[PDB]
Design a protein around this ligand. Structure first.
Ligand SMILES: [Mg+2]
Ligand SMILES: [Mn+2]
Ligand SMILES: [Mn+2]
Lengths: 153, 155
């Protein structure tokens, strides 16, 4: 439990949150784990009615896929390693951005992105507000038409 | 008002059956026909409950829904009069367009992304959603090309 307001957080507060937490390894160091081949390691660092905070440990094999967070704003802090944040572009020229250790970014609830290209041993802290309850997972058929599946997580 | 429908969700086929049968019963919707001189596309509610939403839409040639999805709602359209253009997005910009003319209908599942543009003034269509259309995702494109989905409450 942290000293946060009794409400949903905007993306500026979420960014400060992931960084403040990166600066307190005492609360996330023990949850680091790189499954040799299970699923992308999730570790709840704090969950309440207003915020979900996760620690993610990445293998080179991990990819979120194109997705959105419905109504949830979000922030990411790379603790170690580096991630690839891609934002969709109609036309196929998808904007791609390498986010290196020490760096962080945030976004509002309308964000569509994909996290991948994780160098082995990468560690990141992800916070969502309101809590992440439903996501939209996009897919493109062989023909080219795009879909959005609402999923539970 | 309210239609006498089952107390459960309807699938795509049932939603298409519904909009087609309502077209054949103008007593249920003829009175709600209206084409705004100005003030946004006209929507009139025919039925809203915990399982199904039904709307009558009256189109002017300018009207446009924009690119959007229906979250978890399956849906169906019947064009009663005139015609609409049903566009489906394509990464590349070559969006798939399809004129839906009077008498014609189509259904879709919850994963559908589309845009409907009124093709002719005086067009009228019936739209049904199950589960109810209480949340809608409206897509936008910045000149950078980056696309974003704004979730909206339509309940
Ligand atoms: Mg709390
Ligand atoms: Mn995400
Ligand atoms: Mn629609």
């Amino acid at each position: 439990e942290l000293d946060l307001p009794e409400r949903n957080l905007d993306r500026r507060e979420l960014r400060d949150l992931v960084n403040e937490l990166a600066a307190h390894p005492e609360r996330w160091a023990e949850h680091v784990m790189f499954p040799e081949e299970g699923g992308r390691h999730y570790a709840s660092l704090h969950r309440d009615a207003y915020v979900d905070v996760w620690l993610l440990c990445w293998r080179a094999e991990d990819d979120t896929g194109w997705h959105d967070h419905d109504i949830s704003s979000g922030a990411v802090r790379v603790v170690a390693g580096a991630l690839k944040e891609c934002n969709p572009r109609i036309g196929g020229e998808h904007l791609e951005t390498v986010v290196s250790e020490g760096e962080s970014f945030s976004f509002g609830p309308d964000h569509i992105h994909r996290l991948t290209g994780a160098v082995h041993g990468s560690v990141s802290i992800h916070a969502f507000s309101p809590p992440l309850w439903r996501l939209g997972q996009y897919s493109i058929d062989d023909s080219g038409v795009m879909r959005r599946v609402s999923v539970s997580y």
